């Protein structure tokens, strides 16, 4: 009777549902899965000792987007998202700054508190090399006396 109901329903769906290449020839629910990932991160981040320059953040749809002002025509803001939680001290992270930078943050991230340090250092260097990048242009341009 199964095949009778199949020919009643036009065709024989067990053939395509069982055959591979023959199957090769023959949205609101997904949105709610991203919001459930922030409830897990928000409690571990909520328990740990977040540094003072990182107390302000904006929980975005499936991520935590936190900012701190600098320069270079942008703001030092990053997006963070991960999965593990069982370890309270160390917290694996998956972040991005708003090809080498991606693997560098995926490299230093795969080891919570470390992220800032590295970033801080980087910013510092970029502020030095800001200075360097300015001094060069001062050494070439309006450099009257070099002594």
């Amino acid at each position: 009777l199964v095949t009778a109901l199949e020919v009643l329903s036009l065709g024989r769906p067990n053939l395509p549902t069982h055959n591979f290449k023959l199957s090769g020839v023959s949205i609101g629910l997904i949105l709610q899965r991203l919001k459930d990932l922030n409830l897990t991160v928000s409690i571990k981040i909520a328990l740990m000792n977040i540094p003072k320059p990182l107390n302000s953040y904006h929980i975005k749809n499936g991520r935590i987007y936190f900012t701190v002002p600098n320069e270079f025509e942008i703001q030092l803001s990053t997006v963070n998202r991960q999965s593990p939680l069982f370890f309270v001290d160390l917290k694996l992270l998956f972040n991005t700054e708003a090809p080498r930078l991606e693997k560098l943050i995926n490299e230093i991230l795969l080891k919570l508190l470390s992220l800032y340090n590295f970033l801080h250092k980087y910013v510092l260097t970029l502020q030095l090399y800001m200075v360097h990048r300015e001094f060069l242009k001062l050494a070439n341009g309006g450099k009257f006396s070099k002594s």
Binding site: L1, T3, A4, L5, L8
Partner: peptide, 19 residues
């Protein structure tokens, strides 16, 4: 309807592929 399947599905048991 089931009445078509009780009288039509009986002829599907006797049938070799066509040659």
């Amino acid at each position: 309807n089931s009445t078509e399947l009780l009288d039509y599905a009986t002829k599907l048991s006797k049938f070799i592929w066509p040659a």
